[PDB]
A paper describes a structure:
The smaller 50 kDa light chain (LC) possesses a single zinc-endopeptidase domain whereas the larger 100 kDa heavy chain is comprised of two domains—a target cell receptor binding (HC) domain and a translocation (HN) domain. The BoNT HC domain is responsible for targeting the toxin to a specific cell type and the specific receptors involved have been identified for most serotypes. As with all reported structures of the BoNT receptor binding domain, present is a characteristic β-jellyroll fold at the N-terminal half and a predominantly β-trefoil fold at the C-terminal half of the protein.
This novel toxin is a mosaic molecule and is now more commonly referred to as BoNT/FA (as well as BoNT/HA) due to a LC similar to that of BoNT/F5, a HN domain similar to that of BoNT/F1, and a HC domain similar to that of BoNT/A1. Here, we present a new crystal structure of HC/FA at 1.95 Å resolution which reveals further structural information that is unresolved in the reported structure. Specifically, our structure reveals a loop previously unmodeled due to lack of density, which is of high importance, and we also observe a disulphide bond which was not present within the previous structure. However, it further reveals the presence of a loop (R1261–R1268) that has been shown in other subtypes to be involved in ganglioside receptor binding. Crystal packing has enabled neighbouring chains to interact directly with this loop, provide sufficient stabilisation to produce good electron density. The specific ganglioside receptor for BoNT/FA is not yet known; however, considering that GT1b binds with high affinity to BoNT/A1 and that HC/FA and HC/A1 are structurally very similar, we propose that BoNT/FA possesses a similar binding specificity.
Residue numbers in the entry: 862 to 1218, 1225 to 1288
């Protein structure tokens, strides 16, 4: 759909990235490309000569035009910058004889930038920029998967959409003929920092200007909404430790008062800060008590957490794992949660239904499969204790805001460095 003229997608039969658009453009993958073992569409391009992908376009879809509209879309994940770049570097190039289109990255004045450049055969350039600050407590963008869509209307504007939403437009109507290349080079080109890399997936080209609705539907269809995601946007997994971010108070972190059914877990603050003047100023994410999601009812062989999976939650306390559990017979709607010894869980409630996209992800069950409530928090004499509460289940269908039950799961990731765990 959408006049797609290139659709880079992993194919099991040939066991490689191929063009699935129907035009059979050849995809040459360098030896220095790395792939995710969990999602084989995710590819990592590092700052090495062999870490490159080259597309040899079907000769009928090469762009050589003054008036034809075209669009591109892709997902990208860019590590946090710890050093000034001021050093714009290419990542996706379709240029010949100084004409064509190009995606480049830069980091300047605490802003990470994604730059779209068009250049016509008279040498006239137009650029459109998406940028985001590194001076921010918790970013929607730093080191997290971003869905990018760039549309080009030769009569008027080039537009950048980010996660399905128009965020910038620049006039391109004065550009003349644009004669782009026979091939597309995916490769960090001109980057002076040897540690830089990117992750990318699902690169597409379209020979029209996509509209708002097509882009939102593209964002949704490529989102894999049946699979829960961690904070970085990767697949949520079993047997993987996660730090917990509560979106209703993000400046707090999780702690355990004591283990055992008489103890409780609670949110304390403030979150720390990781700071270097004129480079970054962020809240620390690798803090507090870790959760590990454990398989219960799911029979899938793989370690991917899916919508409506029934799981156990283990809690890590001084390098030892306990079970998140509660006695559903305690008084009140709010059931205070405990970290109990795994052999001693007995008949305490412990089964959690995981829910993908609000963002309330954990619905605790009793052993009749009845809802005890989403896991959130509640104030008990100025202590914000962790609770399962059916108040959430009655409420999150009424409004569309953040609730105390809205969480993100944060694993340690190479693209986000901190001193303390
Ligand atoms: Cl169009
Ligand atoms: Cl999710």
């Amino acid at each position: 759909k959408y006049n797609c003229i290139l659709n880079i997608k992993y194919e099991m039969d040939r066991d490689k990235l191929v063009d699935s658009s129907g035009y059979r453009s050849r995809i040459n993958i360098g030896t220095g490309v790395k792939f995710s073992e969990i999602d084989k569409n995710q590819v990592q391009l590092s700052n090495l000569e062999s870490s490159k992908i080259e597309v040899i376009l079907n000769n009928g879809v090469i762009y050589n035009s003054m008036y034809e509209n075209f669009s591109t879309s892709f997902w990208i994940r860019i590590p946090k910058y710890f050093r000034n770049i001021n050093n714009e570097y290419k990542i996706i190039s379709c240029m010949q004889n100084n004409s064509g289109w190009e995606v480049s990255l830069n980091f300047s004045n605490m802003n990470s930038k994604i730059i779209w450049t068009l250049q016509d055969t008279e040498g006239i350039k137009k650029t459109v920029v998406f940028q985001y600050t590194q001076n921010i407590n918790i970013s929607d963008y730093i080191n997290r998967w971003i869905f990018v869509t760039i549309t080009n209307n030769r009569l008027s504007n080039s537009k950048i959409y980010i996660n399905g939403r128009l965020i910038n437009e620049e006039s391109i109507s004065d550009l003349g003929n644009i004669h782009a290349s026979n091939n597309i080079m995916f490769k960090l080109d001109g980057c002076r920092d040897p540690h830089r890399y990117i992750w990318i997936k699902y690169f597409n080209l379209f020979d029209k200007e996509l509209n708002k609705k097509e882009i939102k539907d593209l964002y949704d269809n490529q989102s894999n909404s049946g699979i829960l995601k961690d904070f970085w946007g990767d697949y949520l997994q079993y047997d993987k430790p996660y730090y917990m971010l509560n979106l209703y108070d993000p400046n707090k972190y999780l702690d355990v008062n004591n283990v055992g059914i008489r103890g409780y877990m609670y949110l304390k603050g403030p979150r720390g800060r990781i700071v270097t003047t004129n480079i970054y100023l962020n809240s620390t994410l690798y803090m507090g008590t870790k959760f590990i999601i454990k398989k219960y009812a799911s029979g899938n062989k793989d370690n991917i957490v899916r919508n409506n999976d029934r799981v156990y939650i283990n809690v890590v306390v001084k390098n030892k794992e306990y079970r998140l559990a509660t006695n559903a017979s305690q008084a009140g709607v709010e059931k205070i949660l405990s970290a109990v010894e795994i052999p001693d869980v007995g008949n305490l409630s412990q089964v959690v239904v995981m829910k993908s996209e609000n963002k309330c992800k954990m619905n605790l069950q009793d052993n009749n499969g009845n809802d005890i409530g989403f896991i959130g928090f509640h104030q008990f004499n100025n202590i914000a204790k962790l609770v399962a509460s059916n108040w959430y289940n009655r409420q999150i269908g009424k409004a569309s805001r953040t609730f105390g039950c809205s969480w993100e799961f944060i694993p340690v990731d190479d693209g986000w460095g901190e001193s303390s765990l």
